Homo-oligomer: A and B are copies of this chain.
């Protein structure tokens, strides 16, 4: 009656929010965001050394891009191609050389290394970038690569 009518109204509000929010999400993701599954990649539009880009992500409430999938990597790669800038991933074998780990300290459930990589070139390459072709290369942490954080 008066409850029928006000739930019926609660109905319209929630539909209005889904359409509005839906169109808003599109707006947010253009042009510096990629959506794939339940994760979002977003670029900061610029480049920084690993430690500098790493802290950018953590405090924004997310973390460096950690594609655990060829699908996540291809989307991330869509972002890297776009800026025409190779980007850091979250992974680092700085604990123990030769074995790369996610920031929790876990081990890689997925990789997309480029031929010859990782080679720890110079005896000092413990971070990872992703190329415009989507493939991986371990590299020194002090190099400035595109900042892309996952959410």
Give residues in A with beta carbon < 8 Å to B: 1, 3-4, 6-7, 10-11, 13-14, 17-18, 20-21, 23-31, 33, 38, 40, 42, 44-45, 56, 60-62, 147, 149, 151
Contact = CB atoms under 8 A, between A and B. Distances in A.
A60 B24 CA distance: 11
Contacts of A40: 23-24, 27
A17 to B, nearest CB: 6
Given A21-B21, A23-B151, A28 B28 contact: yes
A60 B17 CA distance: 20
A14 B12 CA distance: 11
A11 B6 contact: yes
Contacts of A31: 44-45, 56, 60, 147
A18 B17 CA distance: 7
A6 B20 CA distance: 21
Contact of A33 (B20, B25, B27, B151): B27
A30 B3 contact: no
Nearest to A61: B26
24 contacts: A3-B3, A3-B7, A6-B7, A7-B10, A10-B14, A13-B14, A20-B25, A23-B40, A23-B151, A24-B28, A26-B60, A27-B28, A27-B29, A27-B40, A27-B42, A28-B28, A29-B60, A29-B61, A30-B56, A30-B61, A30-B149, A30-B151, A31-B44, A31-B45
